[PDB]
Amino acid sequence: ELTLDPDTANPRLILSLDLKGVRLGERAQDLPNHPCRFDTNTRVLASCGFSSGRHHWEVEVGSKDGWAFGVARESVRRKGLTPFTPEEGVWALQLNGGQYWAVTSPERSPLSCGHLSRVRVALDLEVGAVSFYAVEDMRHLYTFRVNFQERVFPLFSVCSTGTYLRIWPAKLDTYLQ
């Protein structure tokens, strides 16, 4: 099953022991600053990435602000403060200011989807799409159509305390998403 990759994790994140969950901690861990580790934005990738076929997983989401999740192209920049945008190869939903957003470009799109508890992510590297559904009725939340040109990885970001993400088998915090 999909697990979070601790070698990629921003050192301020805390991963659960089973490597399925992530939240933001209060202090940075002293970790090796390896090239695939996010050193500024509060991100972690799954350890498995995909280059063909259709794949899905589910993400339990906290009720409070601070998270964004979806997929990232493998070449997503790890070093320095980077934008959290489709142009940087991030295709994600976000909970911020009590609103759900698809993190679209040039600006985010607010989603009138009601309350979210668990979200199924469907990644299709054949058609070229990543889609999000609320699991309880599979209502559609957002689809990014993307001509993916490299491997694509499950992506998770938690930039404030009080929230979390779990896999199911800087003026403002969000500037570090």
Coordinates of C-alpha atoms in Angstrom, one line a residue:
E1 CA 0.0 0.0 0.0
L2 CA 0.9 3.7 -0.4
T3 CA 3.1 5.1 2.4
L4 CA 4.6 8.5 3.0
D5 CA 8.3 8.8 2.1
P6 CA 10.1 10.1 5.2
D7 CA 13.2 11.0 3.1
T8 CA 11.2 13.6 1.3
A9 CA 9.4 15.1 4.3
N10 CA 10.0 18.7 5.4
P11 CA 11.7 18.4 8.8
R12 CA 8.9 20.3 10.6
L13 CA 6.3 17.6 9.6
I14 CA 5.6 14.7 11.9
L15 CA 4.8 11.4 10.1
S16 CA 2.9 8.6 11.9
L17 CA 4.8 5.4 12.7
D18 CA 2.9 3.5 10.0
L19 CA 3.8 6.2 7.5
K20 CA 0.2 6.8 6.6
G21 CA -0.4 10.1 8.4
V22 CA 1.2 13.6 8.5
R23 CA 0.7 16.7 10.5
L24 CA 2.8 19.8 11.2
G25 CA 5.0 19.7 14.3
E26 CA 6.2 22.5 16.6
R27 CA 10.0 22.0 16.0
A28 CA 12.1 21.1 13.0
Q29 CA 13.6 17.6 13.2
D30 CA 17.4 17.4 12.7
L31 CA 17.4 15.4 9.4
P32 CA 19.8 15.0 6.5
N33 CA 19.2 17.7 3.9
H34 CA 19.1 15.3 1.0
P35 CA 18.2 16.5 -2.5
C36 CA 14.8 15.0 -2.5
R37 CA 13.8 16.5 0.9
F38 CA 11.5 19.6 0.9
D39 CA 13.5 22.1 2.9
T40 CA 11.0 25.0 3.1
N41 CA 7.5 24.1 1.9
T42 CA 5.7 21.8 4.3
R43 CA 5.4 18.9 1.9
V44 CA 5.9 15.1 1.7
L45 CA 5.4 12.6 -1.1
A46 CA 4.4 9.0 -1.1
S47 CA 7.3 6.7 -1.7
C48 CA 5.7 5.2 -4.9
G49 CA 5.2 7.2 -8.1
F50 CA 3.3 6.2 -11.2
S51 CA 4.1 6.4 -15.0
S52 CA 1.2 4.6 -16.6
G53 CA -2.3 3.3 -15.9
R54 CA -5.0 4.4 -13.5
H55 CA -4.5 4.5 -9.7
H56 CA -6.4 5.6 -6.7
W57 CA -6.1 6.1 -3.0
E58 CA -8.0 7.8 -0.3
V59 CA -7.1 10.6 2.1
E60 CA -8.7 11.3 5.4
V61 CA -8.7 15.1 5.9
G62 CA -8.9 17.2 9.1
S63 CA -11.8 19.5 9.6
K64 CA -9.5 22.6 10.1
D65 CA -7.4 24.8 7.8
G66 CA -3.8 23.9 6.9
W67 CA -3.8 21.0 4.5
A68 CA -3.5 20.6 0.8
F69 CA -3.1 17.3 -1.1
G70 CA -3.2 15.7 -4.5
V71 CA -0.3 14.8 -6.9
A72 CA 3.0 16.3 -7.9
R73 CA 5.2 15.7 -10.9
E74 CA 8.4 14.0 -9.7
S75 CA 10.4 17.1 -10.7
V76 CA 8.5 19.3 -8.3
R77 CA 11.0 21.7 -6.8
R78 CA 12.2 20.7 -3.3
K79 CA 14.6 23.6 -2.3
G80 CA 13.7 27.1 -1.2
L81 CA 10.3 28.6 -0.8
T82 CA 8.4 27.6 -3.9
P83 CA 4.9 28.4 -5.2
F84 CA 2.1 25.8 -4.6
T85 CA 0.7 26.0 -8.1
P86 CA -0.1 23.8 -11.2
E87 CA 2.8 25.5 -12.9
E88 CA 5.2 24.0 -10.3
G89 CA 3.7 20.6 -11.0
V90 CA 1.3 20.5 -8.0
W91 CA -2.3 19.5 -8.6
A92 CA -4.2 19.7 -5.3
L93 CA -7.2 20.6 -3.2
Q94 CA -6.7 22.9 -0.2
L95 CA -8.6 23.8 3.0
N96 CA -7.9 27.4 3.9
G97 CA -10.0 30.0 5.6
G98 CA -12.7 27.4 6.2
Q99 CA -13.2 27.0 2.4
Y100 CA -12.3 24.1 0.1
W101 CA -10.3 25.1 -2.9
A102 CA -9.0 23.6 -6.1
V103 CA -5.6 25.1 -6.3
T104 CA -6.0 26.4 -9.9
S105 CA -4.1 29.0 -11.8
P106 CA -4.0 32.0 -11.9
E107 CA -6.0 32.0 -8.7
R108 CA -7.7 29.2 -6.6
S109 CA -11.2 28.1 -7.3
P110 CA -13.6 27.9 -4.3
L111 CA -15.5 24.6 -4.2
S112 CA -19.1 24.5 -3.0
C113 CA -18.8 20.8 -2.1
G114 CA -20.1 20.7 1.5
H115 CA -18.0 19.2 4.3
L116 CA -15.2 16.8 3.5
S117 CA -14.1 13.8 5.6
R118 CA -12.3 11.5 3.2
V119 CA -11.4 12.1 -0.4
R120 CA -10.7 9.6 -3.2
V121 CA -7.9 10.7 -5.6
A122 CA -8.0 9.1 -9.0
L123 CA -4.9 9.5 -11.2
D124 CA -5.1 8.5 -14.8
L125 CA -1.8 8.7 -16.7
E126 CA -3.4 7.3 -19.9
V127 CA -6.1 9.9 -20.3
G128 CA -4.1 12.5 -18.4
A129 CA -6.2 13.6 -15.4
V130 CA -6.2 13.8 -11.7
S131 CA -9.7 13.8 -10.1
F132 CA -11.0 14.2 -6.5
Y133 CA -14.2 12.7 -5.1
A134 CA -15.8 12.8 -1.7
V135 CA -16.0 9.2 -0.7
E136 CA -19.4 9.1 1.0
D137 CA -21.3 9.6 -2.3
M138 CA -18.4 9.9 -4.7
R139 CA -19.5 13.4 -5.7
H140 CA -17.0 15.1 -8.0
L141 CA -14.9 17.8 -6.4
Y142 CA -12.4 18.7 -9.1
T143 CA -10.5 17.3 -12.1
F144 CA -7.2 18.7 -13.5
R145 CA -6.6 17.7 -17.1
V146 CA -2.9 17.4 -17.5
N147 CA -0.6 16.0 -20.2
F148 CA 1.7 14.4 -17.7
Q149 CA 5.2 14.1 -19.1
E150 CA 7.0 12.4 -16.2
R151 CA 6.3 10.2 -13.2
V152 CA 3.5 11.5 -10.9
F153 CA 3.6 11.1 -7.0
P154 CA 0.9 11.4 -4.4
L155 CA 1.4 14.7 -2.7
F156 CA 0.6 16.0 0.9
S157 CA 1.2 19.3 2.6
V158 CA 0.3 20.6 6.1
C159 CA 1.3 24.2 6.8
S160 CA -0.5 24.8 10.1
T161 CA -1.1 22.9 13.3
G162 CA -4.5 21.7 14.2
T163 CA -5.0 19.6 11.1
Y164 CA -3.7 16.4 9.4
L165 CA -3.9 14.1 6.4
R166 CA -4.0 10.3 6.4
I167 CA -3.7 7.8 3.6
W168 CA -6.4 5.2 3.5
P169 CA -5.6 1.7 1.9
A170 CA 6.5 33.8 5.5
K171 CA 3.7 36.1 6.6
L172 CA 1.1 33.4 6.3
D173 CA 1.3 29.6 6.8
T174 CA -0.1 29.0 3.4
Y175 CA 2.9 30.7 1.7
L176 CA 4.7 27.5 2.8
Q177 CA 2.1 25.1 1.4

